[PDB]
Design an enzyme around this catalytic site. Sequence first.
Site, PDB file in Angstrom:
ATOM      1  N   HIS A 186     -25.921 -11.736 -25.483  1.00  0.00           N
ATOM      2  CA  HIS A 186     -25.137 -10.581 -25.035  1.00  0.00           C
ATOM      3  C   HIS A 186     -25.021  -9.484 -26.098  1.00  0.00           C
ATOM      4  O   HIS A 186     -24.758  -8.346 -25.757  1.00  0.00           O
ATOM      5  CB  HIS A 186     -23.748 -10.964 -24.504  1.00  0.00           C
ATOM      6  CG  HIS A 186     -23.016 -11.967 -25.331  1.00  0.00           C
ATOM      7  ND1 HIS A 186     -22.183 -11.616 -26.375  1.00  0.00           N
ATOM      8  CD2 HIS A 186     -22.944 -13.314 -25.227  1.00  0.00           C
ATOM      9  CE1 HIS A 186     -21.630 -12.706 -26.877  1.00  0.00           C
ATOM     10  NE2 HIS A 186     -22.076 -13.751 -26.199  1.00  0.00           N
TER      11      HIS A 186
ATOM     12  N   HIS B 259     -20.478  -7.201 -34.692  1.00  0.00           N
ATOM     13  CA  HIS B 259     -21.504  -7.027 -33.689  1.00  0.00           C
ATOM     14  C   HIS B 259     -21.290  -5.655 -33.095  1.00  0.00           C
ATOM     15  O   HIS B 259     -20.311  -4.968 -33.429  1.00  0.00           O
ATOM     16  CB  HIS B 259     -21.377  -8.073 -32.590  1.00  0.00           C
ATOM     17  CG  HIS B 259     -20.068  -8.029 -31.877  1.00  0.00           C
ATOM     18  ND1 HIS B 259     -18.956  -8.705 -32.329  1.00  0.00           N
ATOM     19  CD2 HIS B 259     -19.684  -7.365 -30.760  1.00  0.00           C
ATOM     20  CE1 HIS B 259     -17.942  -8.461 -31.513  1.00  0.00           C
ATOM     21  NE2 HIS B 259     -18.361  -7.653 -30.555  1.00  0.00           N
TER      22      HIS B 259
ATOM     23  N   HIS C  76     -21.855  -2.973 -29.378  1.00  0.00           N
ATOM     24  CA  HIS C  76     -22.029  -2.833 -27.938  1.00  0.00           C
ATOM     25  C   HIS C  76     -22.716  -1.468 -27.863  1.00  0.00           C
ATOM     26  O   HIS C  76     -22.329  -0.549 -28.579  1.00  0.00           O
ATOM     27  CB  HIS C  76     -20.684  -2.769 -27.206  1.00  0.00           C
ATOM     28  CG  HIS C  76     -19.872  -4.012 -27.350  1.00  0.00           C
ATOM     29  ND1 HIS C  76     -19.929  -5.049 -26.441  1.00  0.00           N
ATOM     30  CD2 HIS C  76     -19.018  -4.408 -28.325  1.00  0.00           C
ATOM     31  CE1 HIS C  76     -19.139  -6.030 -26.852  1.00  0.00           C
ATOM     32  NE2 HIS C  76     -18.577  -5.665 -27.993  1.00  0.00           N
TER      33      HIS C  76
ATOM     34  N   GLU D 103     -17.157   0.807 -25.721  1.00  0.00           N
ATOM     35  CA  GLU D 103     -16.233   0.105 -24.842  1.00  0.00           C
ATOM     36  C   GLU D 103     -14.957   0.932 -24.771  1.00  0.00           C
ATOM     37  O   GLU D 103     -14.521   1.303 -23.687  1.00  0.00           O
ATOM     38  CB  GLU D 103     -15.986  -1.303 -25.381  1.00  0.00           C
ATOM     39  CG  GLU D 103     -17.304  -2.104 -25.422  1.00  0.00           C
ATOM     40  CD  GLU D 103     -17.079  -3.585 -25.307  1.00  0.00           C
ATOM     41  OE1 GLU D 103     -16.402  -4.153 -26.195  1.00  0.00           O
ATOM     42  OE2 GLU D 103     -17.578  -4.175 -24.328  1.00  0.00           O
TER      43      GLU D 103
ATOM     44  N   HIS E   2     -17.829  -3.679 -33.802  1.00  0.00           N
ATOM     45  CA  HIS E   2     -16.628  -4.497 -33.817  1.00  0.00           C
ATOM     46  C   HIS E   2     -16.667  -5.456 -34.984  1.00  0.00           C
ATOM     47  O   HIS E   2     -17.529  -6.341 -35.030  1.00  0.00           O
ATOM     48  CB  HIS E   2     -16.516  -5.314 -32.523  1.00  0.00           C
ATOM     49  CG  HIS E   2     -16.121  -4.497 -31.339  1.00  0.00           C
ATOM     50  ND1 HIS E   2     -16.280  -4.935 -30.043  1.00  0.00           N
ATOM     51  CD2 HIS E   2     -15.583  -3.259 -31.253  1.00  0.00           C
ATOM     52  CE1 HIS E   2     -15.861  -4.001 -29.209  1.00  0.00           C
ATOM     53  NE2 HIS E   2     -15.434  -2.973 -29.918  1.00  0.00           N
TER      54      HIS E   2
ATOM     55  N   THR F 106     -13.256  -8.462 -25.543  1.00  0.00           N
ATOM     56  CA  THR F 106     -13.850  -7.656 -24.462  1.00  0.00           C
ATOM     57  C   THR F 106     -14.960  -8.393 -23.701  1.00  0.00           C
ATOM     58  O   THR F 106     -15.585  -7.836 -22.801  1.00  0.00           O
ATOM     59  CB  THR F 106     -14.410  -6.334 -24.981  1.00  0.00           C
ATOM     60  OG1 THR F 106     -15.532  -6.583 -25.837  1.00  0.00           O
ATOM     61  CG2 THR F 106     -13.337  -5.555 -25.723  1.00  0.00           C
ATOM     62  N   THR F 107     -15.216  -9.636 -24.091  1.00  0.00           N
ATOM     63  CA  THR F 107     -16.187 -10.472 -23.389  1.00  0.00           C
ATOM     64  C   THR F 107     -15.529 -11.802 -23.076  1.00  0.00           C
ATOM     65  O   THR F 107     -14.571 -12.190 -23.733  1.00  0.00           O
ATOM     66  CB  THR F 107     -17.448 -10.799 -24.237  1.00  0.00           C
ATOM     67  OG1 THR F 107     -17.059 -11.384 -25.492  1.00  0.00           O
ATOM     68  CG2 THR F 107     -18.281  -9.543 -24.464  1.00  0.00           C
TER      69      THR F 107
END
EC number: 4.2.1.1
Length: 258
Positions: A62, A92, A94, A104, A117, A196-197
């Site tokens: 992901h 990591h 996004h 996000e 993040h 958020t995941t």
Amino acid sequence: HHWGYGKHNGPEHWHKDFPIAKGERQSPVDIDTHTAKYDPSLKPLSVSYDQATSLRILNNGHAFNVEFDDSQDKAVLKGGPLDGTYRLIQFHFHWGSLDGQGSEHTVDKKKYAAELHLVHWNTKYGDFGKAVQQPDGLAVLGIFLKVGSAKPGLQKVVDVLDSIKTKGKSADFTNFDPRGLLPESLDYWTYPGSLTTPPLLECVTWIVLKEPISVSSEQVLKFRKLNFNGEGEPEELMVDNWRPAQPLKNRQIKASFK
Ligand SMILES: NS(=O)(=O)c1ccc(C(=O)NCc2ccc(C(=O)c3ccccc3)cc2)cc1
Ligand SMILES: [Zn+2]
């Protein structure tokens, strides 16, 4: 049928396996800058990454995580809205399929090209696993990325992505200094939120920096060459691995600046 970011397993589907997705403290959220309020009770934010020890980088299907050795008090975040010391465990990103989307959190509905993040756990809880069962267990420092000038400190990450193209692949990644990914200013907004995941746990104190860092088009393009799939499987580019803004509900976003 694992969660993901596609039509049939994307954000709109997560609540089925993870009911908390419709919780009272979900992330990310849109940061309405005019509604956020300066908070005088916030202490100076302290980001101490001088002794950070990176160990490995991994494509987890992901996003990709740069992991740190958190067995000792090294890279820590403290101050700001935080009580105590939070230890860096991994960072990591996004990002989107296009420069106009990918972050996000949003700022007055503006979406940035990507969002970094830096994940930390409260040391009062012993380790990450215990921390993610506490309301003040984690602190994630979020930093927006816009496309423009390249970020020199990010190039080492960009260059290793070729070796972790598919899900499950990892590579040694030592001596990476996350100080090279920070903007000049530490002005920020903060609010109580969640991962958020999936599992979307509500254990995070979010600290989102106002100043974005700039990365080059070439650098983000390489993020987009990664794959969600495993080696030898049909290729699905790893893009748009972001969750959209969630209801703010009963929360107030506080600002560290006027
Ligand atoms: N995008 S974000 O920064 O908000 C973000 C940060 C970190 C994790 C993350 O670490 N996810 C993996 C994970 C591994 C183990 C546990 C865990 O120990 C646990 C799982 C379910 C219930 C209780 C504990 C939780 C999450 C997920 C998202
Ligand atoms: Zn994240």
